[PDB]
Amino acid sequence: RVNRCIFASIVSFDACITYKSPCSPDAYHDDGWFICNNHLIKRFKMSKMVLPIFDEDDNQFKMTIARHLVGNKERGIKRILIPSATNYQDVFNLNSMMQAEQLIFHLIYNNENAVNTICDNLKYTEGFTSNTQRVIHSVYATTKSILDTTNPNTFCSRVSRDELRFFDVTNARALRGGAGDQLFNNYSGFLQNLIRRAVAPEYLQIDTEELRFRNCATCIIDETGLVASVPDGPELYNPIRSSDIMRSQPNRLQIRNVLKFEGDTRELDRTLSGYEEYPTYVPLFLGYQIINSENNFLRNDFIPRAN
Amino acid sequence: RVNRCIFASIVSFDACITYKSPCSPDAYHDDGWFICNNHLIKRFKMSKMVLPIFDEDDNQFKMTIARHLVGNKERGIKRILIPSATNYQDVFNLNSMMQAEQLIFHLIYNNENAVNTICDNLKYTEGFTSNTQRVIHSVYATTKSILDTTNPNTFCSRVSRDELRFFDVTNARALRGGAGDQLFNNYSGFLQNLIRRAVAPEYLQIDTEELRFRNCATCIIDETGLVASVPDGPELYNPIRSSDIMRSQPNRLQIRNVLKFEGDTRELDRTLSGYEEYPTYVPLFLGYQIINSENNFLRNDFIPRAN
């Protein structure tokens, strides 16, 4: 009934022109992700999806998982999914989109100086006190109201030190972790919640048993933020297919369409019926997870967690 | 209209007891495989499935791929998918099933001595010449009629040397291959066709472009046949779930159901709607493929192929 996306309250606070809100209907779900899918695929290279864990005794249990939207020939900056604090202002080219987007992003990355600069650049204009002040305060309040819940510290911490989620394999039966954990713990609580819900483990630990869902990692935590780079090998094929983009003619991309497949393949598809198609898009997979015996996985209330 | 599975012609040539034929309806498809899915999952640890390849210019192209039916705690013999000539009679305990099954398996692995022994053991019985003679010729003729088509040599070879399928990564832009290729070329044409349609490459080569579908291998070619052992790590999780088994109560397995998941997770599934479920089962993925420029992939007529 109520939207639960940070970008859902985006407003072009000129008080004259209306504003957009392209959030998909899944934003209203209490899934734990606080970004609508459209904003997830437009702002970052991610896409919500679910990973179901089965058994032999007919039991269902599912955990969320993200997906790449990056291709092959894109290298460097274009491979970045969630840039870190140092490398976000350059990759989001913030002087292009709306002012409220800049405010939201600067709140996300704890850049208070940018917030003050946008506020005092807004202040000098005519008609600020009419509606701009109240609208910018409403946007700020909504962003804070979404940011605090994801934050672990807050006023009174509802933190559950149960799911030891380490994005590394060093002393698996311990709390020892590499610099990846230090980099991951350097994000805002919203960022940590998003990256925790986005990437699913390839090794899992419940009670005393060990589970495995992949053989090699897919992404890696870097100083340039979360980057979709396969370790030790050429980048994985990703067909991109269809995704939304800002189409208002500011500038056009070259794209340089890598594949065309000019041949005809109607008969081959016709002769192969439903065989559980198993789509070949590349999902995220990184890290080692440990679950304590006492913990529960049915806490629908969004709890930031901490390892 | 006509079944294209070897095991579809299985008949208990006693002329008194009726015969079984549990092939699924997909056996009648001209999909390239020559084993019904039911026999595929009952005799070997495979299950047919398809894998579509996309582009950016709205084109479709799909190739076959097999699936594991092996769990985690199974080690050694139970990890064997398609046993080789040396290690097939021990793993298939051939003295337990029907005689015709033994004949088929001995024809598959070019064990002519076993064929002659089964024939001259059948010869001495009463009523052999009445109908058992013609039934054993019927079974032999059908098995040979399926075996020769997959065979490359035969009478006149319809072999195409365009697809270079290497189950190794050594001198990718060359014909050099490791011992895996030598072991693979030691199988019957039926076996080669099955393992060619079962495992899909992790790198693909069309013209000059390089494609990728996995970051690390899943199975490995051994002297003990095709064994489903992931390299460099613990065995992958596989729920097994529901599969057919010989249900006549001769003996009962311990199974030792590994997971039970006593917890309740109805609400967690309720709060997550359709999010591209992405099933987490383990498919086969091994080898490097090269496609020449002029080759075609719409040949409905099955061709054994040779690298």
Residue numbers in the entry:
A (entry chain A), B (entry chain B): 14 to 320
Paper text:
Baculovirus Autographa californica multiple nucleopolyhedrovirus (AcMNPV) has been widely used as a bioinsecticide and a protein expression vector. The DNA genome, along with the baculovirus basic DNA-binding protein P6.9 protein, is encapsulated by an enveloped, rod-shaped nucleocapsid; the major capsid protein VP39 and some additional minor proteins are known to comprise the nucleocapsid. Surprisingly, the C14 symmetric base had nearly identical features to that of the apical head, except for that in the central regions. Both the head and base could be further segmented into three parts: an outer shell, an inner layer and a central region.
Local refinement of the main helical cylinder in the AcMNPV capsid resulted in a 3.2 Å resolution map for the major capsid protein, which was sufficient to build a de novo atomic model for VP39 directly from the density map. Asymmetric units, which contain two VP39s, are related to each other by a rotation of ~18.5° about the helical axis and a rise of 44.1 Å along the helical axis, generating a right-handed, 14-start helix. In contrast to other dsDNA viruses where the HK97-like fold is organized with icosahedral symmetry, VP39, with its HK97-like fold protein, is found, for the first time, to be organized with helical symmetry in baculovirus. At the center of the VP39 dimer, cysteines (Cys229) from each VP39 form a disulfide bond. Residues Asn270-Pro296 in the C-terminal region, in addition to Tyr250, form a ring-like structure, creating a “hole” for the insertion of the “E-loop” from the adjacent VP39. These disulfide bonds lock the neighboring dimers together and are likely critical contributors in the assembly and stability of the helical capsid cylinder.
